Design a protein around this ligand. Sequence first.
Ligand SMILES: CCCCNS(=O)(=O)c1ccccc1
Ligand code: NA
Length: 116
Amino acid sequence: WVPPEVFDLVAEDKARCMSEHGTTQAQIDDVNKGNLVNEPSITCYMYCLLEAFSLVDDEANVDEDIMLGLLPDQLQERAQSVMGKCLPTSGSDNCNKIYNLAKCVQESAPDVWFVI
Ligand SMILES: CCCCNS(=O)(=O)c1ccccc1
Ligand code: NA
């Protein structure tokens, strides 16, 4: 659902976050297919990108309002519902916190969790 202009807003942060964490595009594609394991190279990537867009703070607490605001009108009710179930985050560290949220959201609504 991401609009095509988001993709250059994000390009520099994407390149940075992939390089910092050893993330591959293949791993990003996998998350988008609904497959996600608790591997730091992908989970720290997701944390990295959320932070980049100011959607999480230094302990992976989620700014849900800022998050919903980046979603299409048609997705927001469902997204707000799932965030109701899946927040607040919890986990062993910032990456694991986002792993657990990604899993939660994917289990429960699997049109909401896209990873750029
Ligand atoms: C739902 C977020 C999961 C990780 N997504 S994202 O950060 O790549 C992103 C997606 C859409 C808008 C902004 C950031
Ligand atoms: Na890894």
